[model samples]
Target: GSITVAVLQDGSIIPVEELPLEKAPVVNILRVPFTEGLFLVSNRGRVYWIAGSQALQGSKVSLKSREEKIVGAFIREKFGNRLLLATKKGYVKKIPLAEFEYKAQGMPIIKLTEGDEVVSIASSVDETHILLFTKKGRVARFSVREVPPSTPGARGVQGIKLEKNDETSGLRIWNGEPYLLVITAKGRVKKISHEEIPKTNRGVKGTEVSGTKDTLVDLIPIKEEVELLITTKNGKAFYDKINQKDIPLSTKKSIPRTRWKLEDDEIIKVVIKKSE
Candidate 1:
């Protein structure tokens, strides 16, 4: 259910703002329970760190944007150096969280290429344990028990946004680690990264990520080391590869055409393959 009030120090809820359900209609609501501290998780893949006591302090969770989805909440037994994020393809990542601190904008949690999602998130403890299954597939899952441990970090970043709900299509890693293939609905495309997005330059590098007739859709990953579906936690396609011949040197330039059909947010969920 959506929150109407902020949780107080007394464990009681009080009104903060009246929800305008009158104008916004209703949708999905996700909830995750916890203890010491709460992690307000977003479906676009962000985690807001809140001290359980903050509720008493009148703290409320906010998203990077109103459009971003709130998945649920989680309890923190302790803080780990990294976050182990698992996607639907069974692709699991141990991403560093050592440098992160809460902000008005929560941190981007996972970078995907084109797959299902951040199906689960856990702190990896070096406990090597076991995975038991039954003939009927009844399972006693022990991902971390005796599993050995290690940690790593150092990070900062921004995620993508869509003017339209279905604007983004898909993104994946390709061969060149540095070049990105940010494709659009009209098949228009571009290559960019942290220091290069028009966000700072305001498209001094080009007209737009997408054309007037279409919206930005796909982004393929091209670094040869790992092959995994990579999407921005904001549910937009992300390709940090900033250099590629396919991308024009003219700053305000972009590929002039676009792509395949998809449902909303489908771009962040599917991988595109070339036909033989």
Candidate 2:
């Protein structure tokens, strides 16, 4: 069973298409940007290029990997024809899109560290660097300038947490800037400017405090400069300004049961994209 596809823009949902996965189980599906109508769907370990309304009439390509699980995958037009894939076991591999259809000629997987699991992976708007966030509160920037031999298994970049107690729960990069929005498990959200991050500190963190603890799940930027939308596990959503800190005391009075019963609300994922 599959649900109808809908595009959410500016808080409105527009019906796209009704895609059925009865024929094949869809392990993952990613929409291709800067294209008319394209999508990349992965089933098992194979990927397919989907196009048009039917959403099924496309070519299939198998990614060569027998020992690793495809945890998360994204596409970025780099080096003219190459695309980067970030894996669950902390391996970032580069594969050329042109040659991938004919044969799987990928280089040795670049292994990351133990605690450095690739939670959310995204590329800059310019496709210059691949940003990776770990479960243990770490954010790393990988670029074409140099490639490390292997990732060092340390607690933080140089064996320290990003902050004293800020555990990274979710990560999202801004639309056109190098800034990143980070949410912590303790319900704290902060905006980290790219320049604020250290270049070679092994484990450098950010300093810009965009927002404070308001929710537990994720912090997504809705408006570039104004407001951000936060959703709780109980399905409650709210829009707050970037300058706002400290969940208002009056607002807590409205949800007495939720405040008293639940220690912290459950939040799954958050994404912020501009509407055209």
Candidate 3:
């Protein structure tokens, strides 16, 4: 029987005693969410709901999109019953978990002010905010609460620009909070507070500024503190708000181009295996 297990530091595999089952039905693993003993996995074009620590079994739904590839997926705990998915083509879809149905309230495709190709997508835990990033260095945010009013010639709901990066690979909200953090291809990590971002003004023109250099591939918050454990292309760095400094957490070198996720205190690297 196939089962998902957590690899321990001492070279041992600890089987999730509760989630023992077979392999996932999906082809590729893209994202995973765990909350209150329930685990959700997004792969290819389907999302799986796994109960207890066992293999996926609860429910699976086919994502609605011609493009079968999902770049990202996240759960909105604050929404009561909702999940978000982002496609390789820059489409953001919101689906209700209760009914497993897609909602009409999807975000418009993020246009590249300079180049094409969306690299990543992230949503706030509340489901009220979304962040989109492109390979050509463009970033935008869509607010679910501020949908435009319906009127003649009025542009319907659309995402607003937050920042543009002519040179970055990944973007995610730090600890899923108000601050937005960006990671560059070269492995530079930069933290931008909500206060530094300009507010929307009727007449004031917005200016673009160069982003700070930091290659943070993943970030996880530390308890209730603003501090974060950030993993980079080359190593891990710790950002302590109380200390006001970025400290290197590890010296081990890994593939900097690959993406990573935080599970408890460990950073898990995603590897795509080729079948023979």
Best-performing candidate as measured by TM-score: 2
Q: Record all residue pairs in model 2 with backbone atoms less than 3 Å apart, i.e. clashing.
A: 157-202, 157-203, 187-213
Tell me how many residue pairs clash in candidate 1.
Answer: 37
RMSD of each: 17.1, 9.5, 11.3
Q: Write the per-residue lDDT of candidate 1 for residues 1-276, one digit (tens) a residue.
A: 223332221122223343222221111111213234555545455667554333523444565654554433334444465555443333344555553435444776565545334433444444322221111111122334222222322121111222322221222212223434455443344444412222221101122433234444344433322222223222233223223444553222444433333344323222322211
Model 2 residue 154 CA deviation in Å:
24
- Which regions of candidate 3 fall more than 4 Å away from where they truly are? 1-44, 53-80, 101-128, 146-179, 199-276
lDDT of 2 by residue, 173-250 (tens): 334353444554444544445554444432345333323344334433322444444444443334445432322222
Instruction: Give Cα distance to truth, residue 5, candidate 3, Å.
Output: 5.1
Residue 21 lDDT, candidate 3, scale 0-100: 38
lDDT of each: 0.35, 0.35, 0.32
Pairs in steric clash, model 3: 19-53, 19-54, 20-54, 137-165, 187-215, 188-213, 188-214, 188-215, 189-214, 189-215
Candidate 2 Cα misplacement greater than 4 A, ranges = 1-37, 41-45, 56-81, 101-127, 142-144, 147-178, 185-188, 201-269
Model 1 CA deviation exceeding 4 Å by range:
1-37, 52-60, 65-72, 75-81, 101-104, 129-276
